[PDB]
C-alpha cells in the first residue's frame, strides 16, 4: 500500500547493482540488490544467535551471550561453540550494516536527495568496526572484542574501563561525552522550539521562524537559525562518535596505564611543578 | 500616569486589601512564633 502522495516517486532506476532485477518493493520496503544482501545477513546472524542460545543452554533473552574466542586463539579461527559463532555473526553484522548503508544510497538516488544519511550511518559502522575489528586486530586477539549479549556486553565495558582505572580520565572520552550531552541538549531544544511554533497557545495562529529566532535571541542572545541547527545536530552526533572511536583505538595500543596518571603532564610542567600549595603541592 | 494602567484610586483600593491580607497573615505568624517560643525558646 502507498502513501497518498507516494505513487509519483516509484519510478525505475537509481540502483547501483542489479539494474531492474531487484528494483521492486515489498510492502513499504524497497528491496534492490543490497536489500537481498541485507536480509540474508540479518536473518543468518539472528538465527546463529538463537543457535548459540541452544549451545549455551538458556532461553532467557537477557542471559543469551555469544562470547568471542579466548585470547589463546589470537586472531585465528576458534571452534564454533567456543568463539567461532561470534566470528561468523560479526561477519554477518558487518555484511548487514554495510548492505544497509548501500541500500540507503540507492534510495537516495531514486529520490534525488543528498547522501547525508548513508554517510552519517557509516560513522556508526566505523565505531562498531573499531570495537570488534580494528582494535582487536591491533591488540592481537579477537577476545578483546565485546560479547553479543544484552547485559554481558556491559560487563565488557566495565572490565575494559576499569583495566585503566577510572575511564572518565581518558581525554578523548571526555570530549566524546561532551558532544553526547550537548547533542541531547540540542535535540530537546530543537524539538521543543519547532513544536512551540506549530502548536502555539490555544486560538493563536501558527508562529513563524521569525518567532523562533526571536525566542532564542530573547532567551540567550543568539539564534543559530533553521539551517544551522540541522548542521549542528548532525555534526554534534558525528563528532561524538568520532571521538568515541578515537578514545578506544588509543586505549591499550598507545596508552596502557591508569588514565588518571596522564593528567600529571600538566601538573609537572616545569614552570610550576614545584610551586608549593594547592592540591598537587 | 503610570506603567500598569491602574488608576490612582484602583491602586488605593487594591493596596488597602493587600495590606489587610498581610496583617491577617502576620498576625497568625506572631501567634505561631510566640507559641513556639513559649514551648521551646531558641535564644
Amino acid at each position: 500500500a502507498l502513501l497518498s502522495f507516494e505513487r509519483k516517486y516509484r519510478v525505475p532506476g537509481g540502483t547501483l547493482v542489479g539494474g531492474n532485477l531487484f528494483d521492486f518493493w515489498v510492502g513499504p520496503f524497497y528491496v534492490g540488490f543490497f536489500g537481498v544482501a541485507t536480509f540474508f545477513f540479518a536473518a543468518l546472524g539472528i538465527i546463529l544467535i538463537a543457535w548459540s542460545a541452544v549451545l549455551q543452554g538458556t532461553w532467557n533473552p537477557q542471559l543469551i551471550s555469544v562470547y568471542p574466542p579466548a585470547l589463546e586463539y589470537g586472531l585465528g579461527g576458534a571452534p564454533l561453540a567456543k568463539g567461532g559463532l561470534w566470528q561468523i555473526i560479526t561477519i554477518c553484522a558487518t555484511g548487514a550494516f554495510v548492505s544497509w548503508a548501500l541500500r540507503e544510497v540507492e534510495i537516495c538516488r531514486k529520490l534525488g536527495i543528498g547522501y547525508h544519511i548513508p554517510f552519517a550511518f557509516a560513522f556508526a559502522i566505523l565505531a562498531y568496526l573499531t570495537l570488534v575489528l580494528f582494535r582487536p586486530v591491533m591488540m592481537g586477539a579477537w577476545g578483546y572484542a565485546f560479547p553479543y549479549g544484552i547485559w554481558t556486553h556491559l560487563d565488557w565495558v566495565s572490565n575494559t574501563g576499569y583495566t585503566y582505572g577510572n575511564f572518565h580520565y581518558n581525554p578523548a572520552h571526555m570530549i566524546a561525552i561532551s558532544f553526547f550531552f550537548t547533542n541531547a541538549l540540542a535535540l530537546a531544544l530543537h524539538g521543543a522550539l519547532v513544536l512551540s511554533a506549530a502548536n502555539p497557545e490555544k486560538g493563536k495562529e501558527m508562529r513563524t521562524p521569525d518567532h523562533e529566532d526571536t525566542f532564542f535571541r530573547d532567551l540567550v542572545g543568539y539564534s543559530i537559525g533553521t539551517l544551522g541547527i540541522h548542521r549542528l545536530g548532525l555534526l554534534l552526533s558525528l563528532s561524538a562518535v568520532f571521538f568515541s572511536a578515537l578514545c578506544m583505538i588509543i586505549t591499550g595500543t598507545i596508552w596502557f596505564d591508569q588514565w588518571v596518571d596522564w593528567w600529571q603532564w600538566w601538573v609537572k610542567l616545569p614552570w610550576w611543578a614545584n610551586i608549593p600549595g594547592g592540591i598537587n603541592g | 500616569l503610570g506603567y500598569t494602567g491602574l488608576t490612582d484610586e484602583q491602586a488605593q483600593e487594591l493596596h488597602s486589601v493587600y495590606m489587610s491580607g498581610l496583617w491577617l497573615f502576620s498576625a497568625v505568624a506572631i501567634v505561631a512564633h510566640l507559641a513556639v517560643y513559649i514551648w521551646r525558646p531558641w535564644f
Binding site: 534510495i107 536527495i113 524539538g191 518567532h211 542572545g221 543568539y222 545536530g233 | -
Partner: protein, 307 residues
C-alpha cells in the same frame, strides 16, 4: 565532489534584525550585538539582542554568585597563587558537608558551609531560568514545550543535589563542585551501589541518550539531504507540504517501513531527549533508597547469572 550544504558558500548581511514584538515588553530588550563572520559560515552571524527583565536579573545575579563562590574557594585552595590556580584548576573541589553533619546547616564554612551557600545560589539561578524560559515563550504566544523540556533536566539535577540527599539523610550524598571531583563522585557512586550498569533505569537513560544521537544524526542528515528543496523551512513544510517533506518521508518508509511527518519528527525528538533525564532521575532516586547493590538485584531479576 558536489556541494553538501554543511558550510555556506556566500554570506549576505542585511540590516540588523530586531525580531518579533508580540507581547514582549520591548523596554527590557537590549540593542543588537555585533555580527560574527565566523558564525555566519555555519549558522546566523547576528549576535543579540537579548531580553533581560526580572527573572533574567535574578537568574544572572544568582548564577554569578554561584560561580563567584566556587571561584573564590578555588583561589583559596590555590593559596591565592596565580600559578597554582592554573596548575590545579581541575583538581580544586568545593565538597559538600561531611556525613556526621547529616542535613544540618551547622557544618563549618571550610567543612561544607560554602557548599551550601554555593548550592543555594545554584538553586535560585536554575529555577529562575526555568521561569524565564516559560515567560519568554508566553510573551511570544508560543507553546511551553521548551519550559517543560527543561523541567526534565531539572528533575535529574534536583535528584542529584537535593531530593536524594534529603531522602538519604545527609548532604554528603550530593555532588561536589569541581571538574575531576564530580567525575570521582560519579565513579564512586557506581561502586558503592554495586555497578550502576545493572540499574535498569540507567540502562534506559543510556538507550535514550544513544537514541538522541541516533535520531539527531538521522534528522540532521535528512533535512540537509532535502535542503535542496527548502526542507529546512520546516514550519512552511508543516503548513504547506512540499516535495521536501514527501521525499523525506519516502526515504524512511522505503528504508525502514515507517516514517514521520515534519511536525511529528519533532515529537520523537523532544521525547527521545526528555526521556534521558526523566528515566535517569528515577534510576538515581532508586539507588541506595531502594536498591543498594544493583548487580545482586540484577541476579534476582533474571538479567545476571546466579552465583
Amino acid at each position: 565532489a558536489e556541494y553538501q550544504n554543511i558550510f555556506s558558500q556566500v554570506q549576505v548581511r542585511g540590516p540588523a534584525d530586531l525580531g518579533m514584538t508580540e507581547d514582549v515588553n520591548l523596554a527590557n530588550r537590549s540593542g543588537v550585538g555585533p555580527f560574527s563572520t565566523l558564525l555566519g559560515w555555519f549558522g546566523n552571524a547576528q549576535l543579540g539582542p537579548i531580553y533581560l527583565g526580572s527573572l533574567g536579573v535574578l537568574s544572572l545575579f544568582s548564577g554569578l554568585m554561584w560561580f563567584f563562590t566556587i571561584g573564590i574557594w578555588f583561589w583559596y585552595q590555590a593559596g591565592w597563587n596565580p600559578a597554582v590556580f592554573l596548575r590545579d584548576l581541575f583538581f580544586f573541589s568545593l565538597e559538600p558537608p561531611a556525613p556526621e553533619y547529616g542535613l544540618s546547616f551547622a557544618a563549618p564554612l571550610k567543612e561544607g558551609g560554602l557548599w551550601l551557600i554555593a548550592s543555594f545560589f545554584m538553586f535560585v539561578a536554575v529555577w529562575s531560568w526555568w521561569g524565564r524560559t516559560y515567560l519568554r515563550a508566553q510573551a511570544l504566544g508560543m507553546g511551553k514545550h521548551t519550559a517543560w523540556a527543561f523541567l526534565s533536566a531539572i528533575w535529574l539535577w534536583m535528584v542529584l543535589g537535593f531530593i536524594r540527599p534529603i531522602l538519604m539523610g545527609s548532604w554528603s550524598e550530593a555532588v561536589p563542585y569541581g571538574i575531576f571531583s564530580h567525575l570521582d563522585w560519579t565513579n564512586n557512586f557506581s561502586l558503592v551501589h554495586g555497578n550502576l550498569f545493572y540499574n535498569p533505569f540507567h540502562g534506559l537513560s543510556i538507550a535514550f541518550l544513544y537514541g538522541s544521537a541516533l535520531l539527531f544524526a538521522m534528522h540532521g542528515a535528512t533535512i540537509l539531504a532535502v535542503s535542496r528543496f527548502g526542507g529546512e523551512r520546516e514550519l512552511e513544510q508543516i503548513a504547506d507540504r512540499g516535495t521536501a517533506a514527501e521525499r523525506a518521508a519516502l526515504f524512511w518508509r522505503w528504508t525502514m517501513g515507517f516514517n514521520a511527518t515534519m511536525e511529528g519528527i519533532h515529537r520523537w525528538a523532544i521525547w527521545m531527549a526528555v526521556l534521558v533525564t526523566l528515566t535517569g532521575g528515577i534510576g538515581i532516586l532508586l539507588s541506595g533508597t531502594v536498591v543498594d547493590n544493583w548487580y545482586v538485584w540484577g541476579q534476582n531479576h533474571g538479567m545476571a547469572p546466579l552465583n
